Amino acid sequence: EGKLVIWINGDKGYNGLAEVGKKFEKDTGIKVTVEHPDKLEEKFPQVAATGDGPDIIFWAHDRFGGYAQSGLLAEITPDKAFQDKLYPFTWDAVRYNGKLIAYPIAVEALSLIYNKDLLPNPPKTWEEIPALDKELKAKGKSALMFNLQEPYFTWPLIAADGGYAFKYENGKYDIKDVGVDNAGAKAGLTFLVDLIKNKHMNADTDYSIAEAAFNKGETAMTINGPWAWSNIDTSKVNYGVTVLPTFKGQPSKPFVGVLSAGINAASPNKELAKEFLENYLLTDEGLEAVNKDKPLGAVALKSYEEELAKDPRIAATMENAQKGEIMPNIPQMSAFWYAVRTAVINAASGRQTVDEALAAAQTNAAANLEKIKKLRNVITSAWKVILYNDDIHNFTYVTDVIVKVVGQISKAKAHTITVEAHSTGQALILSTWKSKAEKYCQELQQNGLTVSIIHES
């Protein structure tokens, strides 16, 4: 070789990229073939110690710091003029030991997504959301549903007033300086936990419930990323995508994720890779070819982003991303994620105080990396029918319908579901197999109830 072999994830525009590679071969005579291997973030280092993986790899910047600690990635050498063409902060995302480790391609971050018919003017503050919800709850809906179960989604609030993962000392992260337990994070997590105590959100609320509920027009807001826009498009919801709400006057700080192209260390074709990435792919024509196949979202290349940001959805993605934290690339992050996943789950449930959940998370986040992975392990029926809030105040009727339709359910259980749905916005009725869930949802709906059917799994 001779040639260029590129590995890119399957949910990305892998046919557009090939069209870039087609132009490359037309100009240079070097054949570039694109491939999309299942589990390539895993399939890569099992094929990269032996030496024969791909020349260039696309994935996400947070996993590239540990790729570099394994010396498995070549140091890219862009020049002044070239670096200046991409947003400065995107370069910070691809860096380990004072040294650039990959090329930034796309930029993603959570935004506040809202339903324009339910809520023509989205709130500028988190603080005003409790009242918002009280109002909507009376109109048979709810204000907000997003994924409470995962730290990636709850962190934008927890970090707003001062939370951080690990302190940055230039080039190196300090895994002994964790920012999960300072005054800011306590304030954020207390707000979130109070949202749940005051019944404004159901504590069980996950990605699937939130997507269904927002897309059905049952909740006025949700928090998600560009990857989710397609599904709302399909649905009948006129939606907006805006800046995330402030908390204590400070912007939310979502984690930033950079789609990144790194060059393999055991590749003879390093200079050809550089030429491809810098001169063919990271150009307006080049990103446009990939994006025309399957949208990239916001991009690291200024010239094309300025064009794309004519879309306020993409403008909002970058405004939120610029207000966020670059997701640390080091592998200690695995401990951080466990620490904050566990604190939120425990604080929001009542098993711990906010202050003790975070006190423990500060130690767990900085803790020995193996001791923490050992811990994770120390701790059909896949279709769920979900009951939504509505204007039916006759709980007796609703309780009875659930009892009639669902075989298992007692009257008391049926009633408690009814109360939980109307109180929090949503409640689980049952989880069985696709056939049963469909019969039941269909039946519950015919009786005037407002239901979703959900998979997850």
UniProtKB/Swiss-Prot annotation:
Belongs to the bacterial solute-binding protein 1 family. Part of the ABC transporter complex MalEFGK involved in maltose/maltodextrin import. Binds maltose and higher maltodextrins such as maltotriose. This is Maltose/maltodextrin-binding periplasmic protein. Keywords: Periplasm, Signal, Sugar transport, Transport. Gene3D superfamilies: Periplasmic binding protein-like II. GO terms for cellular component: ATP-binding cassette (ABC) transporter complex; ATP-binding cassette (ABC) transporter complex, substrate-binding subunit-containing; maltose transport complex; membrane; outer membrane-bounded periplasmic space; periplasmic space. The lineage of its organism: Bacteria, Pseudomonadati, Pseudomonadota, Gammaproteobacteria, Enterobacterales. Pfam families: SBP_bac_1. InterPro entries: Maltose/Cyclodextrin-bd, SBP, SBP_1_CS. The complex is composed of two ATP-binding proteins (MalK), two transmembrane proteins (MalG and MalF) and a solute-binding protein (MalE). GO terms for biological process: carbohydrate transport; cell chemotaxis; detection of maltose stimulus; DNA damage response; maltodextrin transmembrane transport; maltose transport. GO terms for molecular function: carbohydrate transmembrane transporter activity; maltose binding. It is found in: Periplasm. Induction: Induced by maltose and the transcriptional regulator MalT. Permanently repressed by cold shock in a PNPase-dependent fashion.
